Amino acid sequence: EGNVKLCSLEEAQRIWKQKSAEIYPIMDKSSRTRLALIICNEEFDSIPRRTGAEVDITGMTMLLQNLGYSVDVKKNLTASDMTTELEAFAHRPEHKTSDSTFLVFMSHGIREGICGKKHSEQVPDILQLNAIFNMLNTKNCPSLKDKPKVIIIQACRGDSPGVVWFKDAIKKAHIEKDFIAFCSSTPDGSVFIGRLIEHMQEYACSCDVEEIFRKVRFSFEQPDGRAQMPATERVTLTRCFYLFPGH
């Protein structure tokens, strides 16, 4: 399974000093109610089965639990069902007494969206990326205002970027803020999810999530399988999100 390295009292002190307190605050361990949602589509009407899905669900579930999240897992949804689930997730009371969330999507994709179980050329079944952000934004999810919302999107695409060959009384709040997305389109557990888990395990103690994502990219810098170069996207974090594993 691997092991999430903990942030020592010493490391935590270092982190708070160096970033001038521009860090997202964490709530008390014994009262906070952190939630995470995994939506995984493995079985589809018209597109290939994603056979490594159960290994990926297991790994992401155990990781997120080890980082302090209660994890819901939903499987084999249409875009409509994903929409319903995301709206419900946004309204969960636990977010009020949480400091953060993770949402993980694992499916096939197209350039502008995630495939639902019924997706076909002739009859689309697509969850737009915009919809995810809209449903979790400050209006629709006030409970996560000013709290980091980490969106992991594995949406496997036949046109994933590849390679080139060479020789040799009222107040205003921002509608959308405190998001970060990390996006993989590489098709065929899966290589991307495995590498992400390894890096979270090794570096959550010492690195903020943005830096962990960079390190994942660094680990993939030389292509060998189908090319992996997962992009960080749609970043409106204003502070560093350290997971402080063990706290």
Swiss-Prot record:
Induction: Transcription and translation induced by M.tuberculosis and a number of different M.tuberculosis components; EsxA is the most potent activator tested (at protein level). One of its GO terms (cellular component) is plasma membrane. It is found in: Cytoplasm; Cell membrane. Belongs to the peptidase C14A family. It comes from Homo sapiens (Human). Heterotetramer that consists of two anti-parallel arranged heterodimers, each one formed by a 20 kDa (Caspase-1 subunit p20) and a 10 kDa (Caspase-1 subunit p10) subunit. May be a component of the inflammasome, a protein complex which also includes PYCARD, CARD8 and NLRP2 and whose function would be the activation of pro-inflammatory caspases. Component of the AIM2 PANoptosome complex, a multiprotein complex that drives inflammatory cell death (PANoptosis). This is Caspase-1. The two subunits are derived from the precursor sequence by an autocatalytic mechanism. The active site is at H108, C156. Thiol protease involved in a variety of inflammatory processes by proteolytically cleaving other proteins, such as the precursors of the inflammatory cytokines interleukin-1 beta (IL1B) and interleukin 18 (IL18) as well as the pyroptosis inducer Gasdermin-D (GSDMD), into active mature peptides. Keywords: Apoptosis, Cell membrane, Cytoplasm, Hydrolase, Isopeptide bond, Membrane, Phosphoprotein, Protease, Thiol protease, Ubl conjugation, Zymogen. (Microbial infection) Specifically inhibited by the cowpox virus Crma protein.
